[PDB]
């Protein structure tokens, strides 16, 4: 029970702020209503706090062991027991398509449900991502492939996304894994892939579906020459799903990692052990990188939600500790050797820290749920009034913030959680150091922060012609211009909005100048990450401010008890974030407006 | 070679070309030690650190100490004990140790530069080796008879511990309840349980350990003032020949399991609970505990700061070497060309932003601790700064919480950039950076948490000091500012200096106003840590700019080759730090100028 849930804040966001309950009980969600939604969140939170979290420590202390001659991995018993708990409740099939055995629901609710597993034992969700991949394989497959996808979903097969090679990580287009077409239309995949998550998973599933990018012989270079292939660990009867002969795809190494140790991160050899790795061309078309980006988009959303979930149970652990730990006297009596001892929540610096953890943890939760409300065209219409096209664009703009800004912030602020515990924070007895170790990875896989920032500017803003960016900007400006108890917050948000507008203009300016002087484009790269983070802060402050507005109406209406405390905290957090986080964006804008290429022209030897 | 990558070149630059410590070398107290000898010593211990000391860095983490309950002792891994012997055999126990205890006299600026290499290669190795330096502290505070014991302890190389912390008394040292009961023969029996004691046992590295234990004499008043300091040896011993006799009643009962620094045995220490008394001797036969122990704390705080700085330095140099070799992607000026030549990642603007950020903070921090060390000898302070002993002492005290607090916090933050430079591989144990992070997380906690450093900085080192040491340092910064290739830096430093003056004035205002409104003092707590960090950023900016000024002179004088490259990087680092770090202080001042106690008045339950 390391994991501390927060269903209350999830429901507040989903219903009182974004109004996702408006589509519940109607249309696609005809058979699921607001009170069923609340019960599902509560149920998976209890399961996460119990069976799923019970093996959080065990997985880290007792990580998988690799047998190099069987090419398999043994997982610790307690963690497998948690996996079965997850399956027995059917939680690998929330938001899964109905025709695959799923329960239809808005994606905002689905990701909120997944938050609890990511918070209690993130690697358990990664192992359990098979069905969701089967759906993507289904959506992209031939009719015949759709039958396989249905089988995989029903049978609970695991799955992997196979891109990375030793010399091709960020530069996916440099991968050299080959695909050799056979007369009967199958392909033989030949190469070595690296860092593949869940490439083997002990006896959790009867099969693993590997989705492998490979370059067909003679195809062009870059990502555009790449194709995607369904490569099952086991051959299987394509009508009954019956498991057959082993396919030539074998794990040949398992990495030793700083954290997330219970997730087998594997070197994967295809067609190197005298057995062909048979693959099937997904959709029987050559459109590899486009197809895998359906999966990359899911992976990036999960990583951000993972980091945010971890920060939130990090904060709540730090809060509970701070509440019971007595140390020192109140600052108004610090000169009195005999003054009463106080719990450390009385100390200004501990309070500064807890509110920093709170505001960012809750600000990020708002961000990922906000992002999710544009993932269904029909939730996007009901709660935002935007059509499918703008919704998709707005969702694509927000993903790199969820991933890039969520991974970086979660890890940073976990430093505060650990600090709240003093020296005991450095002990394994408490979960925060594992939170830190487990979450460090989130700035790296599924595309690094710099890649996130490069995606954000060039594709999600410039290639987008700024349409999504402008929609969100307009919603921020609308809130600013609408009581007076939020007068100061709106002023601080107006400054920050303008600050981000300034950054966007400078970086655009640097791009335009690259028409005349190629090197000018380096200035965009230099400021890309600071800009991504600046947008994340602006969204946090805006969404917190929205939450404070709802909290004041509900407080004004007579809220009492625990409700009253919750709403009071939202008001405090929005005000604290506006007054302590948002002003730094002013300086950041001024730094971006003055970037120069000195650091680019400097001789490498001078570093 | 090793994980540990040294930087003797940058150390000698600071000691000689910037601060002119060589100007006291070869004469008087240091007459047996000239510039050439000092450098050869630095080169020598750098090689020891890169070889035998660093060799057991990984083993200490992977094969950590074990507590034996049958023996109440601790077992160390063989490889790490081999490193310890390498250190002892070289006589590196006694650099800066007083000559009458067998040490080599040297300026403290040189002493800590030598120690940086050990803290970089295997920091626990120095902690286990701090026995002799503790014997010197015991000597200076002890009676004549005790001076004889301390001489035996130094000569025979006994280990040592500082024993303050208890389960209910960490930062609040004065709340400790371990008691001392005076015996007829003038000795004392220490009775209590202490927590988190570094090196409380050390296997068979030494023949005895000197525990320096804070305890309250029966009947003494409360708080730190009621405490006394006691010499409590692991073994009784002949007070004149040093022959080791019967076991004393002070036993390790457990060894903690930690995020990092694993090879450092951190133990619960029981005094007089296993059936034999822990006999102790009142240090100096006076009741003056907390002042006496602070001789040790001041050393411990300097070591922790230098340790964090050492770790960032080798973290940065590891990331740089990696970035030089890793090919990934095309140059940004060719980003749309999928046939463009691949480049090494030092060509990517964000990688360069990240490397220059690591560089500037690493080298800026080395400058800070070496600058701080130039005020730890009266002779060096007068010769290189022209300040008397009293002022020097005050300026050194002012700078320690910056070395410790700002160094601790920055090192850990920027190691994130080091790990990020390796991409996914940074998450692997195959590379040392993830261990650097786990090993350095502790630096913000022991020897006083960052909040305690910030509280000490403002209340004792500025306010109680009447701003004299602070006014001296501000005067040197303003002198540099007033003196053209460094005009922009001096402009930005002027802004930064005023920004810190403002923060100081706001905070002083909040404190003085507590006379008429007690709650006003909470605003000091709310802003103290940010204020400490701003001074650290100001000092780094100043010192790097000073380094650039010497680098300009040296290139003007004709420097070539590797020298030229070094001086060029100092210019780039100084300008980059002034343009990308210092401006943020303006927003931080404005934030400190509008702190309020909303966060203090909020109900705990609203968190
Ligand atoms: C489900 C069960 C298994 C999963 C469970 C475990 C999950 C654990 C999560 C961690 C696992 C991983 O890390 S998987 C590997 C992740 N790898 C990456 O994210 C790749 C990072 N690098 C990049 O993104 C690069 O910027 C690059 C896109 C690869 C650069 O290549 P490039 O050729 O230069 O791209 P570009 O020219 O911009 O466009 C090419 C082509 O790609 C499509 N596309 C690009 N960007 C997209 C985004 N943001 N979204 C959707 N699609 C994108 C797109 O088709 C484009 O073509 P065009 O439309 O431009 O013609
Ligand atoms: C050494 C070889 C052994 C090898 C292993 C060691 C290396 C491992 C590294 C980690 C070791 C540790 O972590 S040991 C534990 C360290 N503990 C702390 O640092 C305590 C942190 N908490 C504080 O500092 C508190 O603020 C406090 C000072 C203890 C608060 O007590 P309080 O009574 O309220 O303070 P105050 O009234 O202001 O002063 C009382 C008295 O204390 C002296 N003193 C305080 N601050 C001093 C500083 N900065 N410098 C010197 N002396 C200080 C001082 O004598 C003062 O008396 P007055 O002068 O005010 O009358
Ligand atoms: C635990 C773990 C699990 C993983 N699981 C999977 C998996 O299941 N499937 C899979 O396909 N992959 C997986 N990966 C691979 C992961 O996605 C890659 O590590 C990641 O995309 C970064 O690639 P890289 O390690 O080669 O780093 P690199 O690409 O070599 O990056 C090195 C550095 O250069 C920078 N850089 C590189 N190119 C650019 C550029 N163009 N512009 C600016 N900066 C740049 C990066 O930001 C980084 O700082 C996993 C990785 C880890 C650590
Ligand atoms: C690896 C390790 C080795 C150690 N080795 C030694 C050793 O050799 N000798 C020894 O004596 N000790 C040692 N310690 C103890 C260490 O010095 C203490 O843990 C440290 O001083 C923090 O105290 P604490 O753990 O009780 O935290 P607490 O005092 O309980 O503090 C917890 C939190 O409250 C905050 N806080 C507390 N009081 C105040 C206040 N007045 N104002 C504002 N904020 C406040 C802190 O900043 C922190 O965030 C070691 C600790 C560790 C982790």
mmCIF file of C-alpha atoms in Angstrom, chain A residues 66 77 91 115 142 194 206 218 246 259 364 444 571:
data_model
loop_
_atom_site.group_PDB
_atom_site.id
_atom_site.type_symbol
_atom_site.label_atom_id
_atom_site.label_comp_id
_atom_site.label_asym_id
_atom_site.label_seq_id
_atom_site.Cartn_x
_atom_site.Cartn_y
_atom_site.Cartn_z
ATOM 1 C CA UNK A 66 16.984 -14.094 -18.140
ATOM 2 C CA UNK A 77 5.650 -14.619 -8.360
ATOM 3 C CA UNK A 91 -9.048 -4.076 -16.675
ATOM 4 C CA UNK A 115 -3.822 6.344 -13.912
ATOM 5 C CA UNK A 142 -6.870 -6.451 -43.646
ATOM 6 C CA UNK A 194 17.333 -3.026 -28.847
ATOM 7 C CA UNK A 206 0.204 -17.726 -24.590
ATOM 8 C CA UNK A 218 15.222 -2.290 -52.113
ATOM 9 C CA UNK A 246 7.849 -21.095 -32.404
ATOM 10 C CA UNK A 259 14.420 1.668 -12.279
ATOM 11 C CA UNK A 364 -0.777 17.900 -14.613
ATOM 12 C CA UNK A 444 13.640 9.132 -22.536
ATOM 13 C CA UNK A 571 -8.148 28.050 -4.606
#
